[PDB]
């Protein structure tokens, strides 16, 4: 909804968000933490080391 | 200690002017957020206004667009409030509160870092 907001004037006085459900994403340091037990599963790891000739 | 003291109030008929003023002593209103609350007896707190220095922003209720100016004199570390086109509506006492930052200007306040004494103001029809 494209929604106004009346009383304010400068727009860096506040910022928006984005927000998204689906699409986990990697322990990654590099990101801010959601609220809430933060885990959902787990996943396997390809390439994995093994003997070889 | 720091104690807000409110003044500036009294009765006046319906469609007049009045300003408040309350001051703080012990400390300056340099990081204080000001915000007025107004409780008419017989109801609960009801916010008015709200003014920064960091934003030199003025964030005013519904009921208060249009009649009420909010204003800061840091030299004589002071808030005042002057309003203006009474209404019956308007009679009750008010306090302001000083509070530093943590965001307590979220819709009711109800923190009161720095609680005052308040001032009457009744308005006669």
């Known amino acids: 909804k494209t929604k106004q907001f009346s009383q304010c004037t400068k727009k860096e006085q506040c910022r928006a968000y984005r927000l998204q459900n689906d699409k986990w994403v990697y322990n990654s340091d590099k990101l801010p933490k959601a609220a809430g037990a933060t885990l959902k599963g787990k996943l396997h790891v390809p390439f994995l080391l093994a003997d070889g000739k | 200690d720091v104690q807000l003291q409110a003044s500036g109030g009294g009765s006046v008929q319906a469609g007049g002017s009045l300003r408040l003023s309350c001051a703080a002593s012990?400390?300056?209103?340099?990081?204080?957020?000001v915000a007025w609350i107004r409780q008419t007896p017989g109801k609960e707190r009801e916010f008015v206004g709200s003014?920064?220095?960091?934003?030199?922003?003025?964030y005013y209720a519904d009921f208060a667009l249009g009649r009420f100016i909010i204003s800061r004199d840091n030299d004589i570390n002071t808030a005042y409030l002057q309003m203006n086109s009474l209404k019956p509506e308007d009679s009750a006492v008010y306090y302001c509160?000083?509070?530093?930052?943590?965001?307590?200007?979220?819709?009711?306040?109800?923190?009161?870092?720095?609680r005052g004494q308040g001032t009457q103001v009744t308005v006669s029809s």
């Open positions: 012990g400390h300056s209103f340099a990081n204080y957020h």
């Open positions: 509160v000083a509070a530093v930052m943590a965001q307590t200007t979220q819709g009711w306040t109800t923190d009161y870092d720095l």
């Open positions: 003014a920064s220095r960091r934003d030199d922003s003025t």
